[PDB]
Amino acid sequence: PQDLEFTKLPNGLVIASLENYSPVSRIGLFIKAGSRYEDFSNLGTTHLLRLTSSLTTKGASSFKITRGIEAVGGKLSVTATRENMAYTVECLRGDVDILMEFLLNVTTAPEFRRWEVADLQPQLKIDKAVAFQNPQTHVIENLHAAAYRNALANPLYCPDYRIGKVTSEELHYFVQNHFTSARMALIGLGVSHPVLKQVAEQFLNMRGGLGLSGAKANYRGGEIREQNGDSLVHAAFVAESAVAGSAEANAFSVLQHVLGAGPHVKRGSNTTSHLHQAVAKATQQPFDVSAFNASYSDSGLFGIYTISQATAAGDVIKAAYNQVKTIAQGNLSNTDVQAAKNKLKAGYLMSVESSECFLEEVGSQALVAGSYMPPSTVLQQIDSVANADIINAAKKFVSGQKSMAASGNLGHTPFVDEL
């Protein structure tokens, strides 16, 4: 009706429904499988696995799946982060059942016929290329490769050498060892609870709970420098932060919103953002500075991401770095802290507004926690963060070992040694 109900089935499948009364029903299966669960042997498997949503299954054919999904008018999509993988299917209210069946066949019995896998292999390169069109994704992938030495270092996109050599046996092994009931969660927004129970009864018989879950994501203060011909260099230097779901993680988030994460006025450099003001007096050419912040189950990463002209590159980063140092020194007023807390609360609510992002958030927190955290609790938690905690987070970032990844001309970008 108005509140969702997290329910853990005896199999281990956390099932939750909301009944939003929207004309479009939306059901997502969030598996705890991700790129971090790959190893050196099967590197890049999850990319193809995400690209094999429409392949033929044991219970339904590829043609049948595609044509049925189109004719119903719904859509099945796969969204993969470094830890979780979501199969989200959106349809009309009276068209759930059919598509739901498809979902089951895509996740429980996905027979990877090798010829279909080979035919899909070339699309890996195209998807990687189109994703890398945005420089931020490329630099962030290099940063993860240069910051961790284990799980989180595994790239989201298939490596170039693995593009044509992902055998279907690897896909089957990954699905069997990771797509299991205790590592999955079914979340339905439009669907009423009993219908979700009925559809999850199909998932009640699956692989055994708690599949392979290894690696600890050990930190590594490494670097990855690209040396491209681009006039504009984009770099990111980051230090270890708190794990996801911790008070210190909230402190780091409030710190990033103090520094500045995105524009709030179109066509206008953020007057309140300390980083933008600091870099503006450092370099006059067009730039863009943000406080990158990622939180994971085992670790976290907080740092500065800057896009600026190569000839001034170093200056920019130094300026940005210096700004954080000042907050580490203790120079942190209360007005900008309250402004950043307002920004964070508003951003969280705005993200939760859209039904897709609400479903993603509910699925993620169901996978990690298993108990729903209402937005009021999130607001209370962020309000709990104090100035001393923010200064401690900034001090930890300044003191900790740093990993940097840059892309561009790289003729003036300092190394992490002299950062």
Add this chain to the structure above:
Amino acid sequence: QDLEFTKLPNGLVIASLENYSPVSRIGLFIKAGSRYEDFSNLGTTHLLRLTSSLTTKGASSFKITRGIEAVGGKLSVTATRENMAYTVECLRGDVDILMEFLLNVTTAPEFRRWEVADLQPQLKIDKAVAFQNPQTHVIENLHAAAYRNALANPLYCPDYRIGKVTSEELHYFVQNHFTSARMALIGLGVSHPVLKQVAEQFLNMRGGLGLSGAKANYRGGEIREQNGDSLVHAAFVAESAVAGSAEANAFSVLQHVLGAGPHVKRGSNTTSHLHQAVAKATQQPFDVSAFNASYSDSGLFGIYTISQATAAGDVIKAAYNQVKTIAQGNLSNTDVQAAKNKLKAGYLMSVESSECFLEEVGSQALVAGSYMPPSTVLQQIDSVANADIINAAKKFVSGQKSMAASGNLGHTPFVDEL
């Protein structure tokens, strides 16, 4: 007879020998190299050594190629990170034509833009064939991960610079680095008076110095190349002493103690401590050597290992331990003498071939200006003592490491772990 490093008034160091071999060999060694280029013109030298046969101001490309072929001689260009040599080999009575060709190629090249554009695709093929052996690729990544300013510049143009090397950059590099004081003319078969004459032909060469810069600052960085190769090649290094120093001799003797290369066909390298250690470390086929490079500004002594991925770490660890044992002082006198014999024999046997002798003389002329006879080299090698070798091992063990690896990389330790 003996060489005499006569220096011309402009600065061109001219040396001549009188080996009565029927092939006369001439070599123009310029102090230009990949280290002398920067981020703006990265990869220029790689194309520069491929433009030897392009048309010049005084001779055409067709004329150069056909004349060199018809004479029967060969014009080749060798390049390292510091020096660039134009070596021309001909018959005794066919020196003037090829010497004029050399003059035109070096002093007054005319980089026609269409010719440069047509030559640029050859860069990809040359880089690919040169990267066929893993050693060169790993050493290039090692230089990129060890230095940060000068020696980090690759010998082969980066992929992004393959199709964008304008002829203006080539002209700028030539006229800022191919200058008289940074060059040396060496003639083996050529008698000294004609060598003086061709040097006089070279007399009006650019200016009297170049845009020498940078200092090759050292970074303890690492480059990891995740590949599907079953075999993994790793190379972890520490900054040794500059070239032409007693400590450089100590590091070379240390590398020959560790084992630089095989000495018996299909041999097990019984003397090589590294091979013996890795043999008990891992049973699958391996290959361990003590990489050692010396330069004017800095140096790099380290361990290069080709092993199986699943054993990679183990292998390098064993190798590392060996040097550590020598650092502790467990260095007897017999193996020291064996390594000194190996070094002296290797140097003298390398000097045998006229090409390598010419290269050695050119390098010495560029960096010293006075020829160092092999007897003095042997004396300097013998001067190295056990304590100096222990000090070199201690410097390697205590110094900041820079490592480059390629392969499966599922078990290779990082720089901090190594």
Add this chain to the structure above:
Amino acid sequence: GKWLDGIRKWYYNAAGFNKLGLMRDDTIYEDEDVKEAIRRLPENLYNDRMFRIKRALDLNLKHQILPKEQWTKYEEENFYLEPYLKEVIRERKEREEWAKK
């Protein structure tokens, strides 16, 4: 059963493709479904089929026959192309059935 098996064995021996070292699936006409079924064959089976067909062509060019010992045996024949061809035909019929609705 037994009578039908005897007639089938007689027909297999009468049809001369076993004399040339061929199997039954090598003889099937190469239409679009068979082309895709061949494309779906594993590399080892594809190479074996290619060599058997080439050897049969070479024998036919020589107007010779493989020795009686080397003839394919009806009781020891593999229908390797049957599953792939049946799957391709099933997919095509599914597409047609959808396209007629």
